[model samples]
Target: GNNLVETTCKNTPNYQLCLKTLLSDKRSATGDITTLALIMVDAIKAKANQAAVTISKLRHSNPPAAWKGPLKNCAFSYKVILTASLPEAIEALTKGDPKFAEDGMVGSSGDAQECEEYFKGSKSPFSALNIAVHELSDVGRAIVRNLL
Candidate 1:
C-alpha cells in the first residue's frame, strides 16, 4: 500500500476514522486519490441508504405522532442524499470535476445534518448514520482537494 491514503486521510477532520474507513477496503492499498474519493462517496451512499431504510421501518412501526414528523422529514432528506447528492458527486468525480464533487459531498452531509436537526429534543436514532455520512464526506472533501 502506498502512503496516499494516509496522506489524504490525515488532511480530513477525523483522521483516525478516515484512515480506518479507507484502509478497510483493500482497493485503497493501490487506489489513487480519485479512487479514494469514490470509495468515500460509495460509503456515503451505503450509509444514507441504510438510514433511509431505518426511517422507513420506523415509520411502519407506528411510533408516537411526535416522532412521526421527524421520521418523515428524515426519510425525505435521506432520499435526496441517495438519489441526488451522492449521484451528482459520482458524476462530478467521474467527469474530472473535483470541485463539484466536493460540493456534492458537502450537500449530502448537509442533508444528514437536516435529518439530525429534526430530533432536537433528544438523540436521534440516525445519529450514528449521520455521523458516518458527515465523516465520510469530510474525508472525501480532503481527497477531492488533493485532485485540485
Candidate 2:
C-alpha cells in the first residue's frame, strides 16, 4: 500500500515480480529500506530452510560419493545463511548501514552457489537453485539501493 514501494518497484527490471514480492509482504507497507530488508530476510530464511531439507533428503538418496560431502555442506551453509546472515542483513538495514546490509545479502547466496558449483560438471538431480537465491538477493539489493 505504500506509494514509495510502488514507485521503486515501478523502476525495477522485473516490475511484476518485484511488485508481487513486495506487495505480498506486510512489512513492505512500511515504505522503507528496513521493511524491505525484513521481507528479504523472511524470503531468504524460508528458502534456506526449504533448500536444506530438500538437499538433505537428496543427499542420502545414493548420491555419488563425490557429491555427498558437498551436498551436506551446502545444506549446512543454507541454514547458516538463512538463520544468521539474513538476520544480520536485516539488522544492518534497520540500523541504516546499507553497505553492511548489502554485504550480508550477498553472503546470503553462498549455499546456492556452492551447491550449483559443486554439481556443475556432473549430472546432478537438479539445478537452478542459484537462480532462485540470486533473485532473492538481487531484489533485496534493488530495494536497498537508495539506502546506500
Candidate 3:
C-alpha cells in the first residue's frame, strides 16, 4: 500500500503498465520519486536492448528483402536509445536534474516510435516492444515531473 507509487502511476499514460513496471522492482516498495523514475528508465533501456537483440536475430534469419531495410533502421534507432538516450537519462537523474532526464525519456520514446514507423504497417515485429518503451518513458516522465 505505497500511496506514492500508486499516486505517481495514476498520472502516467498507462496506469496499469506503470504500476506493473514499478512494482516489479524490489526497490520500488520503498522508493521515492527519483528512484521510481530510475526504475522506469532501466525498464525502457531493457526493452530497447531486447528489441535490438530481436532485430539481430531476425536479421540473421534470411528474411524477405523488404524486411531488411526496416530492420536495419530499427537497429540503429535502438542503438540511439541504448547508447544515448538511456545513458543520458541516468546521467541526468544522478546529477539531480530531472528536466534533462525528462528530455532523455522523451528522446527514447521518440526513437522507439521512429523505429516502429520504419515498418510502414501494422506488422512490425517490434511493435509490442516499442510500445513498452513508450509506456515506460511516459511513466518515467510523469514521475520526474513530480521532482520539478
Candidate 4:
C-alpha cells in the first residue's frame, strides 16, 4: 500500500498554518508588498520552468542510454506558499522556531547544507518547492543508475 503522511522535521506544530498566514498577509506585514509579491510570483514560475527543463533533459539525453530505468517515470509536482521573509522562513524551516535562530538545525547561516536540512525539516512553502526539485532530480539519477 502506498501511504503519504506529512510530518514536520522538528515536530513543530502549526508551522504550515503560520507560513500560510504570513504569506497571505505579506502585503500588510512584510512591507514592499508589490515587489515581494512580484518576486514570489517570478520565483514560482522559474521553479516550474526549471522542473520542465529537468524533465526534458532526462527524456532526451538518450532514452534507453540516458534515462535507464525508473528515471523515465520520474515526475514532479509543485506548489507555492508565501512567507514574511526569506530569512525568517528559512529559520522556521531549519529550527522549527517561530523566530530565526543564530545556530540551530543545520547551522546559523544560510549555507547550502543548512538550507537543505531546513527544507527537510520545516516543510515551508519555499522549502517544499525546493525539496520537490531536489527529489525529482535525485529520483531521476537513481532511475538512471538502476538502468545499468
TM-score of each: 0.94, 0.80, 0.95, 0.27
Local distance difference test scores for all models: 0.85, 0.70, 0.88, 0.32
Worst 10 residues of 3 by lDDT: 117-126
- Give per-residue CA lDDT, model 3, range 1-148, as digits (tens): 6599898999888899999999999989898989999999999988988999999999999868889999998889888889988899899898898899999988887888888888857469878998888778878888889999
RMSD list, candidates in order = 1.2, 2.6, 1.2, 17.8
Give the least accurate 10-residue stretch of model 2, judged by summed lDDT. Answer: 122-131
Ten residues in sequence with the least summed lDDT for candidate 4: 1-10
Error of 4 at 86 (Å): 19
Off by over 4 Å in 2: 11-13, 122-128
Local accuracy of candidate 1 as per-residue lDDT tens digits, 7-55:
8888888889888888878779898899899988888888888998899
Best by lDDT: 3
Clashing pairs in 1: none
Total clashing pairs for each candidate: 0, 0, 0, 0
lDDT (tens digit, per residue) of candidate 4 on 67-96: 334333332222121122233334443344
Error of 3 at 32 (Å): 0.6
